[PDB]
Each structure stands twice: as structure tokens, then as C-alpha cells.
Amino acid sequence: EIPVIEPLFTKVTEDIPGAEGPVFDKNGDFYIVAPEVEVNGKPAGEILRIDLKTGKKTVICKPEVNGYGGIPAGCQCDRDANQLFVADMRLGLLVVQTDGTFEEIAKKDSEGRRMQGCNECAFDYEGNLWITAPAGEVAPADYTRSMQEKFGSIYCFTTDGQMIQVDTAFQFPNGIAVRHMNDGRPYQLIVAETPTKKLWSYDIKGPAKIENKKVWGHIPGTHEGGADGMDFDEDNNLLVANWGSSHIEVFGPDGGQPKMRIRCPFEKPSNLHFKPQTKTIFVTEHENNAVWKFEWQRNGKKQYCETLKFGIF
Ligand SMILES: [Ca+2]
Ligand SMILES: [Ca+2]
């Protein structure tokens, strides 16, 4: 039987519709996105900064392009500039400044196709951004999602600014993570396909170059939902939020079946993020639409924004 641990969870903040994309910037500030905020039945998603002391929220950005509101769902902090890359289910990929100003990255990919709505993104150490796109075409196109049909795609936004679709035909690709070698070279891309209860992997051969698609891991449960967000700890164990299972699964470097499970005091864990240089993990969940934190067994794997461009070692 898979061992299960029940760490102490401390509530940080609440009342954040669809609480997602937890992220820390280069200054140590904490942000979260609220993709499910609606005004008059239309999308009006928000990007928020949270004060870790009081738990008070501040809306820094409410993305909108030509009257079309966004559904921000995933975040990554850049390294060479303190700015956030945000995956939006309606607007695609956005780059957001801490002052609240934002820019739409692309309306079409490298092959001239309309961009699809995105949900999550992950930087590899070379600066390439891997993105999951479970939604259909971005606004003004009618909103649709690949929960039932297989039209979700995977993109790679390269360092030289190219938006390349690297694969498609996924039934709601969601969480994504990059496994790196000890020397820092990116070598494995892990992608969650939510409803199918599978984690897929690819070997990374270079920027926007992936091959050897394989079923990497299996998510437990027959409940509606599945793997949502994920991140690696310093030993390369992959922690995966299993939405609807009340647990966060822990996979070893080689995948397969979970080697441990973390029971949460809520049914819908969605995403998570480690606070830099600590064992503290912040988790967002959709039962109470809140953010919690708990202590893991070790520090998290450094995010791209924590690495040095001009380092020696
Ligand atoms: Ca997600
Ligand atoms: Ca994360």
C-alpha cells in the first residue's frame, strides 16, 4: 500500500475563484491567478499579489484584449527581468509586469495557425517556455475546451521568440514540468493529461525539439478529475496535484506509480509552488477556492528565475 502522510496545512488566503498558478517573483513576492472570476457571465479573470503576512489580496491585472476578458491560469517568473509569463485560456500567452501592465505574446504560432488558449507553463534552464493549451482558439473565437475531445496542444516559446506547436491531440493537457540533468541540461518534459489519469513524458533534444512520447506515470482514482499542477523537489521527486482525489501524489524520478501520497484537508488540490530556498509548499484548491501551505520533506527544485545568467559554477 502506498504510504500516505498528513502534514499540517495552514490556510493563507481564500475567496479566489479557481485559485491557480501560484508563483514567486524575483523579489520574493507571491502571486496567484483567479481564472474563474466573471462579470455579467463573461470572463474577467484576475492576477493577484498576496501579502503573506496578512493574507490580504491586491488585484494587479485584469487582462483584456479588444473587450475580451481573460482566464489566466498558469504562471512562471522570468529570469533576466522580473516579469510574469501567464498562460491564459482565452488570450494565450501573456507577459505581465508587476505594475499590472501586460502584453499579448502571440495570436498565431510559427506555422501561422491561430493560437489556442493556454493553461500552464514551465521554463527549462535554457530559457525556453513549455506550455500546455487545453482550450480551443483564443478570443475572439468561441470558448471551448478539450475535456471531452482530443484537440489540446503543447507549445514551446523559444528564447529567440518563436511560438512552436510541438504536439497535439491531448485530452486536456494540464500540468507540465521539466526534468533537468545534474549539470542543468533539460532532458525530460512531463505533461499531465487530466481526465485520462496519465502523465506523459518526452525526451528533450533541444529547443522545441521533443521525441519519444511515452506514458510516464499513472494517476490513482476513478473520480472525475486528475493531475492538475506539478513541480519537482530538489531530489527530482515530482509532486502532482490530483484534483478531486483529496491528495497530492509524489512520484520518483522514474515515474510509474506514486511512491507516496499527501492527504489534503480538501478534495480539489489544483496547483502548487515552493517558496524559494525552503521546504514550504503553497497549494491552491477549488473546494474552498483558497491557498494553503505545508512543509515538505526537502527544498524545491530551483525555478528558472532562481538561476544565474552570469554565474561561474
Ligand atoms: Ca492547471
Ligand atoms: Ca508551480
From Swiss-Prot:
Catalytic activity: diisopropyl fluorophosphate + H2O = diisopropyl phosphate + fluoride + 2 H(+)
Regulation: Inhibited by chelating agents.
Short name of one Pfam family: SGL
Name used for this protein in its record: Diisopropyl-fluorophosphatase
Temperature dependence: Optimum temperature is 35 degrees Celsius.
Cofactors required: Ca(2+)
Resulting phenotype, residue 243 to Y: No effect on activity
Cofactor binding mode and count: Binds 2 calcium ions per subunit.
Enzyme nomenclature, EC number: 3.8.2.2
Subunit text: Monomer.
UniProtKB keywords: Calcium, Hydrolase, Metal-binding
Effect annotated for changing residue 172 to W: 19% decrease in activity
Functional note: Biological function and substrate unknown. However, it is capable of acting on phosphorus anhydride bonds (such as phosphorus-halide and phosphorus-cyanide) in organophosphorus compounds (including nerve gases).
Top EC class of this enzyme: hydrolase
